[PDB]
Symmetry: D2
């Protein structure tokens, strides 16, 4: 079927499945899984960091990432629309006892440093203790300006703040940048990697940072429930994906801007196109209707005034042609 709801719907490729069934495993609680360790070391090395850790979800990757950075009473400055603030049921505050300090991101997706500075609280018993600055490289598809990344890292060091990046779709950014992962990963103390979305993995996310940081991450992961056993089978896929599915992300990107043009031709009001994501202003009076129309044509989208269409390896251009045709028919 044609699914444009999220790149999270990506299913295992033939090659990936065999890599998995082939991978050697062990008990990762003891650290005896060759594959988990191999994936963790690859990411670490690939990003220029000391150590990495495998978690069940990107949600748990960020929760653990936040608990690891901030103690009870500390606070993190994040985007009002960032994932580890808005889309993680408020875990950091509810579970971690961390005060969140959200601020609106700028149009390009960055967090205005002048605003971040204004939110750093003085060492007064009145306020929470600002500790972390969280970013999200690839925010609703937008790739942060490389210069800004350098600026934030520099900014944080000057203010003694830790810097963490939600790299759910960090490889989309990499491919869009045209550089290596380590070249953007140098500007953050820690960052996450989701294997389950664009890279085509069934389950999996990674938190990468220095040795000590990750050791604290290990205690938190166990507590939050991520301490799995024979994760080797899952990690195997993650290794295969990092060595065979990063480059093709460019194919998704061209499909996004290709589709963006088709919908423009058809008459749909396209709001913007960034990486594997495009947004259309469908409208309130056409939301649910378009949903059904499509859903009928075996096309799955998230019905809404502003529909977010996401691309991935399980959607071809030909299939996009179909949806662009079905859409054109909708509007006229």
């Amino acid at each position: 079927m044609i699914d444009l709801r999220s790149d999270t719907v990506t299913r295992p490729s033939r090659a990936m499945l065999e890599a998995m069934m082939a991978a050697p495993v062990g008990d990762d609680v003891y650290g005896d899984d060759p594959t988990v360790n191999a994936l963790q070391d690859y990411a670490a090395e690939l990003s220029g960091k000391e150590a990495a850790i495998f978690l069940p979800t990107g949600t748990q990757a960020n929760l653990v990432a936040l608990l690891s950075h901030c103690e009870r009473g500390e606070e993190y400055i994040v985007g009002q629309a960032a994932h580890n603030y808005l889309f993680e049921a408020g875990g950091a505050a509810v579970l971690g006892s961390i005060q969140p300090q959200p601020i609106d991101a700028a149009a390009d997706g960055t967090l205005p440093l002048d605003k971040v500075a204004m939110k750093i609280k003085p060492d007064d018993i009145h306020f929470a203790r600002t500790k972390l600055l969280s970013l999200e490289n690839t925010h609703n598809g937008k790739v942060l300006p490389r210069e800004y990344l350098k600026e934030a890292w520099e900014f944080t060091r000057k203010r003694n703040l830790a810097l963490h990046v939600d790299g759910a779709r960090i490889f989309n950014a990499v491919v869009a940048y045209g550089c290596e992962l380590k070249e953007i990963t140098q500007y953050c103390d820690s960052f996450t990697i989701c294997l389950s979305k664009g890279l085509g993995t069934p389950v999996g996310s990674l938190l990468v940072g220095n040795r000590d940081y990750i050791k604290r991450a290990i205690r938190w992961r166990k507590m939050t429930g991520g301490g799995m056993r024979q994760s080797g089978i899952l990690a195997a896929a993650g290794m295969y994906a990092l060595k065979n599915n990063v480059a093709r992300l460019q194919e998704d990107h061209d499909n996004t801007a290709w589709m963006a043009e088709q919908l423009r031709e058809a008459g749909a009001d396209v709001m913007r196109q960034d990486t594997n994501m495009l947004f259309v202003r469908v409208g309130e009076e056409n939301a649910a209707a378009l949903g059904e129309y499509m859903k009928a044509r075996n096309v799955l989208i998230n019905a809404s005034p502003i529909v977010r269409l996401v691309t991935h390896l399980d959607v071809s251009r030909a299939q996009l042609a179909e949806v662009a045709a079905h859409w054109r028919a909708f509007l006229a």
Copy 2:
């Protein structure tokens, strides 16, 4: 000694102390303290609410209120500069496992209902569960419009959201409206009352609401550590304060409005003036230099590029006239 730093410096008048030293007391934990109970029933009756609870501080009155309103994982929309979000060291999140959703307040001190609406979370496992809208009347002196208070009240009912008002200086707004307290508390499910501010009490606050709500608040006040014993001694100052110090707040207002013209007609840059508060932009170069010049003449003002002068019952106009002069002498 001339303290324009805050209205929190007000000291007990001899009549207040006597009222305290001659009050009958009992074990409040056992609910055997006459004066405490008397103070509560009086606040409840005067505001149209069923019950009331006395607490050590407003900070605790709000932490308790927030805990009594939101279960673990629940959320409260508030102002980025509001007290129960910014000035209570993130208590609601750190201790109460409550997710805070702060937004910028409009110029007049209100939380734009349109902005508030966009922040109400869809009922999806993705988000925290929006449950409370917490206001602040008298917000840095600013008196919230009355039509907004009625509109927020209606908005929250149609959204099934509770409405709480941090009334640390509610009586200041009350005198400014020229109405009864009941006429504004009718637009909220719960509100607080600090007696230790302009009303001149040594310490103590009140949280008022529905009988069942307050019953829960009693469990939280205990856990947080506010369940005192013979606190009727303190509650006594409260009654005395509520029966004699409400009307004279108009005197503080006139003085602030007075000082404003004097400082203005003296070379000072008066940004704005609301109730017992005045704001003068002094700037870097003269900030710290101003604090010292004053500190010497016994005039205490929180130095800063933008100084906040707070009038209260312990600062006379004559004394203000003096400071004024001392400020017109600062420029030369």
Copy 3:
């Protein structure tokens, strides 16, 4: 390789892997994964419960269960040596703001109802609010008496307390009782099921209960980070495991009971033997020395003055006979 450390080392059989590699999957967050849903409905139906939820680990199945049962400030009575109190880094309190009330378990593994009763808190603001009684069937191998399970069930209803059972090895007790799973799950409101232990799955657990309870558990599983995507691949091993690996647990039991006689009739001090678990008091002087002697011959046993040997599908009797010999050779 001979791992008697835990039954958590069980590795996937080729038939299990195939079942996993050929399973249809979908986005579980969207509830679109056939196998995951299939696995849940099967566990629910087989236990007499309305709903079921798949999780990354048992540790998370219990944290979620506890959170779904107790609101902030609520409490759960448990065993001092129980898993959701002792071996999950205090998660219920640290992350869930739940007060734990642990008590020593009787010799047979049960929590003495008389002791439990004394621990139920009076409804007074002095105490936490007792709400759950959490058991553990198979408790270090010990099979809880059936009359106690029925008695705890009745006790909790007459006290209006929920009853949860940590069933990490529930099927081990089940085979030992010689009854159906439904006949014991009928005595609890919720229970867990680990598939990654004796049942031989690579990872995964289940929490089962009433439809409304489980709906809440879904919100908590997300927040804690267990809301995976195409997890049907994992859920597949679970179904395969539940349809083929339950009965053969009797083989582990016989082997443990077998090894016990061998080690006993060899000079070893066998304290006790329950289901797939055996305990031998080795003592200080021979503890670490034993671990090394074994470690060399590839036999892995958690060294300690009191060694805990765990049998499972990946350790044959023939292999046990070998270890045995290697142990009778340790004394000389």
Copy 4:
């Protein structure tokens, strides 16, 4: 009236009241209260510690004491029947995110060190991180053996554990010991002092420890709501009590063992007598009945199978004679 429910019902003496109305005050949030500072320095000096802090309640003193000692995920070993575990609505876990590890106290009221050692968790991700050992000198009236205090302190230093003592009635212990406060205070890193119970204060408790510890206590107190303003009026009483009400505690003690004898003569089954507390095994079938009988004779006690009678300065021996007579009449 005659109140034997608790020494918390103690009311202000003429001398105390005048000391209060006389005391000079200020804003303690800024630290400008002469009296609060004077009380804090007196306690500190009197106990041989660096600094002290004034809180509204003993409950908040312990909560703050626990938050100050243990970070999120750390754990404290305390008595199953200790106040900061059982009688503080579980604040440490609910609010502080601290895992509690309670164990039964021995008959003399101490925590068997052999048990404490058994509960210290290894540095493994399975367990919470043992950090603090909490004691309660004067536990239900029992005075801990001095030798044991020395032992626990020594024990904790050897194990790198912090030691805290709930000194709600620490002065009862002092008077019973016959030594100075500093001689028992040397065996703890921190300890609390309740001014509101036996010492005859209306409100008030103190936490005493080293400079850094108390500084952390200050941030926590503010967050939990204890940061009061003109606390001078309350502190004044606390100073008067520490200089005029410690010695007479002996009068309460003799009244307790005097009354214990009278009740024995009358026929009541006295369980034990320690300091200002005695326990009678009234029985279930006579609980409520005795309550009314007494309550009628204007005598207030906590009705129960085992009645706890507490002495204090507001109950004279003559009044005890009355109650012992009313009791005798009850039984015969």
